Amino acid sequence: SHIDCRMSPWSEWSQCDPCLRQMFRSRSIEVFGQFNGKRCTDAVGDRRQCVPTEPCEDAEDDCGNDFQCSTGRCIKMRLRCNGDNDCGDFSDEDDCESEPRPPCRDRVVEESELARTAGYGINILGMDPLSTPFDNEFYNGLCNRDRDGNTLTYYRRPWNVASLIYETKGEKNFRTEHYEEQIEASYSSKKEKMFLHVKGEIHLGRFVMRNRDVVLTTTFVDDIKALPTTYEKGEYFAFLETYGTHYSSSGSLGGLYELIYVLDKASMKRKVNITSENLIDDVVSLIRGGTRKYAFELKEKLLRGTVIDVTDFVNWASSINDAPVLISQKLSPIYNLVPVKMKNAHLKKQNLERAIEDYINEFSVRKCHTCQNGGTVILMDGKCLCACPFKFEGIACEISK
Template sequence: MSPWSEWSPCDPCSKLMYRSRSVEAFGQFKGLVCNQPLGDRRACQPDRVCEEQIRPQCSNTEFQCESGNCIKKRLQCNGDNDCGDFSDEDICEDVKRTPCGKHELELSELGRTAGYGINILGSDPRSNAFNNEFFNGLCNRVRDTNTLEYHRIPWNVATLNYATLADESFSKELYDDSSTLLKEVLQETKESLSLGFSFKFTTTEEVTNDATPSNFNLKFGKQKTENIKKLTEYSSVKHKTFMRVKGKVQLSTFRMRSRDLMLTETFQNDVAHLPVEYMKGEYFRFLEDYGTHYAISGRSGGEYELVYVINKETMTKKETGDKKALIDKVVTSVSGGTAATAAALKMKIEKSGVLDVGAYVEWAKSLINAPVLLHSQPEAIHSLIPLNMPHGNAKKENLERATKDYIAEYSVCKCQPCQNGGTVTLVDGQCLCLCPPQFEGLACQTLKTDLLRDVNIIQEGNWNCWSPWSTCSGSRRSRTRTCNTNGLTGASCKGETESTDYC
């Protein structure tokens, strides 16, 4: 870690001062794991007065909620909580005709959770930016193809389709080593393969005061990290082979509106409390709360994964009295569903080694109440910043900068290269080497058998981090990077040493 920066001046509105630090190199080869916060804050007494942030006045055709938000006057007294604090309904003696008439339709849970936050490095954001309980006076509805009941769709969701698809794919081949398996698991986890093998499943910045974390999301993020760590432990264990089984249940597809999205009061407050001056730690905290991106469209449901760790020596024997002796361990991951049904499914699998039908059915039934994002089209979170908010443009630019800094901060470029063609991977503040099948060890330095000694090996370096961008000249700017071949002979890196961009 770098030393802490100097404390910033005291912010007159938050009455806080800030400082930050950076990761200079991540732990590797049993070094320390770098998973500490990069931002810090403390209370202070400002020497200047906070400029009151006055929200835009509502027009003559709008009603001002107690929160200060403006809604159309036609939304008053319609039975919907359009303000979010019921201030549009509290003044009403009688409710006008409700948008759905005599039909009392429940909000679709798949619509309520649409617009999931996405962290491009892999962690699960702690909050959703969208107020998906706002309907804008409409009664858009969709029919659940399983229950045949109609549910109401929120304003933010342009389209929502129920389409239950169960997909189970059993691995056609066994994995002879954990590195090959890990590489495949991690590749499927990433939102963007262009970032290299850089992953951050665990949030490290403290939660903001207003954010409301989803405990299940945090547990699932921890579950992913623990499973990856379990698999890496087998990288130095001999006589093991692996079989992967994964299943997926898709419930719906959705697409968000492209304009006039309704954001939560919490999100707007958190944006309002962001410093106008760029403070890295505060903006990183915001990104871990809401995501570097959000899902403008996607598929939701649930998925599970089983990795069987098989004793190869037992498997090769002609006879074995105990079939369970073949399986040393089952590494299980369950995503989606209620906490109770997901935990029950996981426990049954780990206890018996097989997928329990009863537990699976209960888990699949619960997905309608607790879906997760299976696939998405991401959109940058900074695009949601209301530009009519005080300092909206400055904060949008700061968030755009923070997203780039966040990706650069947690980059595999801060790792040392692996030997013998190993793939350098950064997972939650620790650099790992995913070795080719014929090598093992922390740096892939050990040949598994002398029979492979004559195999031709291509040594691969690891790119160092990009230099800062040059000054803008002729509407262009550039940056460079070098290939890190530390400890390797005849190694090189694939890719370009220079990058250019418009400015």
């Protein structure tokens, strides 16, 4: 029949947090809606204002001999007046007395847009990238650069990125299959299948971030610092939803495309001439990266299957330079970025770890009810649904025709 969304009862309220002035509670989900059921609302948290008993005394150690930015980020005194912004809002450039001293010393370099957004946060479910937690405009008084062969231009490297290699390489793959079986004795039968798969990838560069002495944006540190000390499922789930669960410590950029074709045929004759002819096709195409003029042109040219000129491949190749995507990642957990110099940072790391494990445990395909006749179960926005093969077209993949 039909199954509706059901959730567990509420838990008990915690004590009042002396700084947030709130108390929290949480529940769980038992079953997702399936088969035209009600999808889940995903309300797993609760919060409410309270009155503390003791006043909230919150502080962090000052820089000391280091400069104190207006956002709280400590920078060294040698960076007080130079050619770069380190406070994040040009707080250090407002008192340049005399004799400016740029670090690169008049050399002609450019801000690389490829490395300016490196370090995407990645959600583990769905693999959708998010905005980088690092602040890639900090240079730490260095002038590290790197040369791009296509334009013969030298691009400055930010502090957080430990490696920036521009390299050109390409790949391809082309596999086809064909079967044909014929059985007859009156009687007859003919079967035939055909498979296509084409895919090729274009690489532009590859980066590796740092591990020790990194600099994060002010907003990420403030969002971390507002977390409750104890373990509250709702608030840490909200943090995970906002910033993802992992961040890419290394990756590549470029583009790719695909083409998938399936053919199936069958017949059966008896002799009262009974004849049957079934023909089934399926074509899929995908393309990522490049410019929305050449890319979609090539996507369409690929579908018709006629032989095309190489110029469009070259045009898409040259346009891949202006809108790269993230083709390969290597994830690292987000709690490794919790700063050492912080109140109860270790407890925040433990809580984040347990909350990531819990978040993986929930929203799992494993609680969805199984389909019938070899269906495939996909979870999409709190509602289980089945995927059926070519032969079956029922809602539960049970109607055969």
